[PDB]
Write a protein that binds this ligand. Sequence first.
Ligand SMILES: NC(=O)CCNCc1ccc(-c2ccccc2)c(Cl)c1
Length: 327
Amino acid sequence: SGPVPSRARVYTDVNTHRPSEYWDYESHVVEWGNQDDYQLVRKLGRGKYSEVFEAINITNNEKVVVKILKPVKKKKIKREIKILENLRGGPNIITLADIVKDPVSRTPALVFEHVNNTDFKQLYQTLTDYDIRFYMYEILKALDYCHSMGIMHRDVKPHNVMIDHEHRKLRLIDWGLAEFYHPGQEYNVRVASRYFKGPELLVDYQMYDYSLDMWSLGCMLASMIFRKEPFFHGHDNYDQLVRIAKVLGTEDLYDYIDKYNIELDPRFNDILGRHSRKRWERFVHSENQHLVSPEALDFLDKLLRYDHQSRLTAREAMEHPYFYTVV
Ligand SMILES: NC(=O)CCNCc1ccc(-c2ccccc2)c(Cl)c1
């Protein structure tokens, strides 16, 4: 009678028990300020529906970040704006300072606090085992916060984590794919970046929850501790599940799809194969061994599980012995 329903093991009805205004972003009233108070400095990057600039607020000589949005779907702009306002001031969540539009073109822009992002290319060698545990803890603070607030990020990846290592400051950014969690809601599976997509998205299991961000965090941790970027290198979305299966094995993949009554796409039939469950220690080499520990492996093992319900929650994760050395 179709796939088996599922709901989050934590913060299940946080939106159900709150007023409609908190989660109804379509009904959210946005009030734009004037862009003229901002001075664009330099291009920091470019997304598919966004253009990110470094800027200065002329009124106080403060460095800000300006994200110009292509109005592809106003509903998505309203969703990002609503979520950013709801999470404002949360631990390690990018702060939305203002919302403005350019008078002439009317293109919407989000103004954020500034993060002085440390040279990551040069950073990949100076980070230690302590650094990884410390920064992992900080991302979990952000996730436990947005999950307690009924939001799932749905795009956790290195690119969306800004680190100012001189000041040990971490910010989770790009809430453009974030969504409000409503138990029983079927979500679009075309979220997150390929390398970070949870098995639920790949097998087309639409009733996912906050545990999706927990899979993405595992992908990130495995790439950090094992210095293998990305950890699951799929070449398409169908191949992505095969890359996971080569590590987690096909046995538990059927245990998963059977548990939730999932219909595997017939495109997998020829490519999936049969794979044994691998051991995390196999990924330890001379290059990475200085960042790998038993605690790190036990933690990793508990995040990268097929079954979204078996994954640690951000709270459970914060308690794990992997984090005993950090405040
Ligand atoms: N948009 C950008 O260019 C920012 C790119 N983000 C840099 C970055 C550097 C280090 C980490 C990290 C991950 C795990 C443990 C400790 C540190 C992350 Cl998640 C991200």
